[PDB]
Amino acid sequence: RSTLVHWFRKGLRLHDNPALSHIFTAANAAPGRYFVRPIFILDPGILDWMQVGANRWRFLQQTLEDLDNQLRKLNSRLFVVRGKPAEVFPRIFKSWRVEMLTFETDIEPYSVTRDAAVQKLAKAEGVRVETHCSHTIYNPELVIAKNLGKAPITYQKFLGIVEQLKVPKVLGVPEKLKNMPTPPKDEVEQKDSAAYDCPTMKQLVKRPEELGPNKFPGGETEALRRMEESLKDEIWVARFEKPNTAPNSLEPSTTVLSPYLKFGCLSARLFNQKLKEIIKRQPKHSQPPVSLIGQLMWREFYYTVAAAEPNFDRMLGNVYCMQIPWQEHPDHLEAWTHGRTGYPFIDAIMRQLRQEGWIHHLARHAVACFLTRGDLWISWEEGQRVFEQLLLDQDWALNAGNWMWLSASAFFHQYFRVYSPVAFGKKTDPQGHYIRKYVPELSKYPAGCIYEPWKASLVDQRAYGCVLGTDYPHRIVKHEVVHKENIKRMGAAYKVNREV
Numbered sequence: 001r002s003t004l005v006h007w008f009r010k011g012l013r014l015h016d017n018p019a020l021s022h023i024f025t026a027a028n029a030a031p032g033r034y035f036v037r038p039i040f041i042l043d044p045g046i047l048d049w050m051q052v053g054a055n056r057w058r059f060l061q062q063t064l065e066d067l068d069n070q071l072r073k074l075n076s077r078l079f080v081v082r083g084k085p086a087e088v089f090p091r092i093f094k095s096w097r098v099e100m101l102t103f104e105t106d107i108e109p110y111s112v113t114r115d116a117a118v119q120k121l122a123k124a125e126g127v128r129v130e131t132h133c134s135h136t137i138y139n140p141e142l143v144i145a146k147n148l149g150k151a152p153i154t155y156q157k158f159l160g161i162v163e164q165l166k167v168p169k170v171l172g173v174p175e176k177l178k179n180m181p182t183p184p185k186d187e188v189e190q191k192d193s194a195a196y197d198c199p200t201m202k203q204l205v206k207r208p209e210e211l212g213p214n215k216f217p218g219g220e221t222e223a224l225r226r227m228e229e230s231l232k233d234e235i236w237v238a239r240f241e242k243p244n245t246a247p248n249s250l251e252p253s254t255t256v257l258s259p260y261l262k263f264g265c266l267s268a269r270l271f272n273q274k275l276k277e278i279i280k281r282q283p284k285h286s287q288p289p290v291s292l293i294g295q296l297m298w299r300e301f302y303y304t305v306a307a308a309e310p311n312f313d314r315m316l317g318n319v320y321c322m323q324i325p326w327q328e329h330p331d332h333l334e335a336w337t338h339g340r341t342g343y344p345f346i347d348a349i350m351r352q353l354r355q356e357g358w359i360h361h362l363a364r365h366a367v368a369c370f371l372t373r374g375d376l377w378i379s380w381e382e383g384q385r386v387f388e389q390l391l392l393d394q395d396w397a398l399n400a401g402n403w404m405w406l407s408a409s410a411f412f413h414q415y416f417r418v419y420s421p422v423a424f425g426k427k428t429d430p431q432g433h434y435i436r437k438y439v440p441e442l443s444k445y446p447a448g449c450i451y452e453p454w455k456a457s458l459v460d461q462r463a464y465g466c467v468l469g470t471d472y473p474h475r476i477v478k479h480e481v482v483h484k485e486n487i488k489r490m491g492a493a494y495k496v497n498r499e500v
């Protein structure tokens, strides 16, 4: 008896999962011949390559638990194998007598390299490998092909391309396993009956004092519930315009499906299909780029440009990316990273980010502009790294692509438009409720100076119980001065890049 193995990496879901569905149908179309091992590999190598904060670890933990629960309902389970894939797969290929391995493809350079090696090993041991592109709606390879070998570098060309492509068929959940015994314990399982059980919170989250509120639980089950909840107001969905949603409302002004889409707890293909059903129902509706479908297309856009550039997450060696002489300032980087810039709107966002692991798209704009072309002139790579650690939705292509946009390094070139760290939040939160919540030391400042506490006299600062320089920092830079200087620095960088 040989085993069929589905390997979760992303695609942490039962629904719309062709790679996992094929495994299951095969076992049921040929009962008694196959064992089924759905596995997730706790790969220590990924930590040399990316940062993971406490909040995102918990999200993964919760996700793996939900996925194990969901597989049990199909007379299966999740096997979480600890170790490096390069060492894990030769062992289990033999110990398990693996006939077929399936997994969902990923375009990230660490994923491509790792997957190539696994496919070289699988070819050697005579293991059949079947891969499916289901993490994105469109296959980036086919978009680039249709565009004659190059990724479209504007959203509108990208839309023009994918319009002519076939939308894939969205699958349901696999059928339960008919009369399948629990696989026999292997070398590892026999010396430890729990060697493959889902990790506890204690095993994954080493810095539990960095956990923030538990607001967006991981898991396919929570993903589907949040999607349904978000789709209930079809008028809100149909008339969604991303630029007009507030960055600093106390409740999220958008869907917060990003962590789920990032891990594949939600199929982007399913979400897209559900969105197109409402749009059909609702004749007055928004259109890309501002619409909710437009939002999913932004995800497709960045995956397509990223798939063509292994150096997408850095300035050097990146075909898309303007070469800009960013400066090194460790103290300013530290202040931004910990929301101690002295600009309450910026600090509010960076603190919501650290504590909760999600901030609105335009709040990411605000803090990203400030770090880079706007105020501090620090590389977008440094902001990417902080975002990587704290974001629940940390996504290799989307984090890099949007940082390049916000820094005017790629895709966006109107660097003379600079967010004000004082004015920008006021449009949608003139009372500063968002600042009061995340910078509570300023909570007694009136709306007239809560965005600009340095406009309050010392007497009033003492009266509000928050003296600048003691209880809340002084501004680390003066926006009105530096952002004018940085526009000149940007223009010089643009000139140098144009001449080369």
Ligand SMILES: Cc1cc2nc3c(=O)[nH]c(=O)nc-3n(C[C@H](O)[C@H](O)[C@H](O)COP(=O)(O)OP(=O)(O)OC[C@H]3O[C@@H](n4cnc5c(N)ncnc54)[C@H](O)[C@@H]3O)c2cc1C
Binding pocket: 242, 252, 253, 254, 255, 256, 257, 258, 259, 261, 262, 295, 296, 298, 299, 300, 302, 359, 360, 361, 362, 364, 365, 368, 387, 391, 393, 394, 395, 396, 398, 399, 400, 402, 403, 406
């Ligand atoms: C500096 C910076 C860094 C970012 N890093 C990430 C990241 O690491 N991971 C991430 O998922 N998004 C990232 N984004 C994009 C965007 O801000 C988030 O996708 C969005 O805030 C998610 O919130 P939401 O799910 O409520 O989005 P909604 O507006 O409800 O959109 C639905 C989905 O569309 C996609 N989407 C929406 N906006 C964008 C966008 N601008 N680019 C790409 N896809 C988009 C996401 O999958 C999102 O879940 C970043 C943006 C900026 C400016």
